[PDB]
Design an enzyme around this catalytic site. Sequence first.
Site, PDB file in Angstrom:
ATOM      1  N   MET A  91       0.909   7.340  -8.863  1.00 23.43           N
ATOM      2  CA  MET A  91       1.744   8.457  -9.296  1.00 23.43           C
ATOM      3  C   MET A  91       1.863   8.477 -10.811  1.00 23.43           C
ATOM      4  SD  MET A  91       4.918   8.867  -6.457  1.00 23.43           S
ATOM      5  CE  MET A  91       5.184   7.142  -5.889  1.00 23.43           C
ATOM      6  N   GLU A 155       3.963  -6.252  -0.275  1.00 21.01           N
ATOM      7  CA  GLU A 155       4.154  -5.571   0.999  1.00 21.01           C
ATOM      8  C   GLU A 155       4.155  -4.046   0.978  1.00 21.01           C
ATOM      9  OE1 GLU A 155       6.392  -9.152   3.544  1.00 21.01           O
ATOM     10  OE2 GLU A 155       7.015  -7.082   3.792  1.00 21.01           O
TER      11      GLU A 155
END
Lengths: 202, 205
Positions: A91, A155
Amino acid sequence: PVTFGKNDVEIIARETLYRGFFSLDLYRFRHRLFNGQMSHEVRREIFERGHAAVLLPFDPVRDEVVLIEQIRIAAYDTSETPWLLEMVAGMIEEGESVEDVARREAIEEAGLIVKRTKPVLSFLASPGGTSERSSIMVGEVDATTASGIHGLADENEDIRVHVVSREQAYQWVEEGKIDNAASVIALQWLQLHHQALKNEWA
Amino acid sequence: MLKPDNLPVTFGKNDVEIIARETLYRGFFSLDLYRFRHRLFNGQMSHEVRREIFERGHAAVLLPFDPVRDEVVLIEQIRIAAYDTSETPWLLEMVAGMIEEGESVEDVARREAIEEAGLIVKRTKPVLSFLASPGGTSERSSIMVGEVDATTASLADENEDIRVHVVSREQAYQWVEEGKIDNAASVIALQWLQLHHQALKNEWA
Ligand SMILES: Nc1ncnc2c1ncn2[C@@H]1O[C@H](COP(=O)(O)OP(=O)(O)OC[C@H]2O[C@@H](O)[C@H](O)[C@@H]2O)[C@@H](O)[C@H]1O
Ligand SMILES: Nc1ncnc2c1ncn2[C@@H]1O[C@H](COP(=O)(O)OP(=O)(O)OC[C@H]2O[C@@H](O)[C@H](O)[C@@H]2O)[C@@H](O)[C@H]1O
């Protein structure tokens, strides 16, 4: 081609129906019909999530591409597996340039230090429901140096790097084994310009 | 037992467990939150991970190609979401429509060709099915090439919201390269067409 522009649309208001990590907004507007006349008030639920930078790692010498494997559960319901084969991407934040996000993510996601880079295409994922725009860059890389599996993982970004021939990756696109917009687009682009890029680089 | 299916990736659906999906916001289009765990490449299992996903259904896409005149029929329409990052919210697109229950991708493409561009599709051919932006949306779009007679240009049913533009394949592609056509379905469709036009023309000859 396109006749109408921004003066042919009056945005009455924007409202955030929901705001969490991402945003779901409501656009209320009136616009010119293809007969001059202005339409009634139209409503549109728009998914606002910022915009992205994408980088296709291409090794001219070896004629190879470096893919990123990571899970995308949104793919769950319509795919056989949520784990997809993709391009490096990230992003774009507060005034960052597309090239810099692309090069930085190449380090973080594939452990590669991109050499020369070049702009490819910039696209809107699905203009009917989300404002998201993705800008693709092709970056010269040495496939030989990509990273492996992280012993202690991230994660929310557990990645596995795959190095394959340019032809292989393209065939997978045609066969549907690679089917996320950024990858399909970048890999089709590479398939239409690979010889000109190989000649330009190295 | 039957042998497992092949995968181009390391894990399958049996390696991930979805704890639940909670609705963040409900409308005809919804924003849900996926809660789940999955195996990691290091062989361990993750803690709960949470993702906001845009649920908006899925679409059918048709690429109107006249192989004899080597032309393409585009559709112009306003896409307000393209506003903040584009010069005009009016885009040049492919025939497309939402896929409804019990409807095939081909049936939607065919129905949409008629009411959006006034075209009657002849032979169709599967092109590719892609995920628009899998990190935040579940949306899946299936593309097909529809053989059409570009001279059948049309006014259509939604001519007040949609305007057709008939152009040469080469002009269509050049506009993709110049950034004049930058919506995903159109870029993917036209690049595929630029890669296969000769074989397709020979096939439909
Ligand atoms: N965000 C929205 N909110 C409300 N109504 C909507 C929205 N999106 C579409 N509609 C309305 O429904 C009509 C078309 O609906 P769909 O069947 O969903 O088809 P389409 O809008 O063309 O979506 C298909 C194409 O656009 C991309 O977003 C998508 O990836 C696909 O390639 C349009 O005329 C519009 O008025
Ligand atoms: N659906 C989600 N909800 C909540 N958090 C999310 C979500 N998606 C990403 N995040 C958070 O943001 C980080 C992701 O940052 P980015 O690297 O910027 O996002 P990315 O996964 O690369 O998505 C951009 C790429 O995927 C496609 O959706 C899009 O077309 C683009 O090519 C992750 O570590 C995660 O914590």
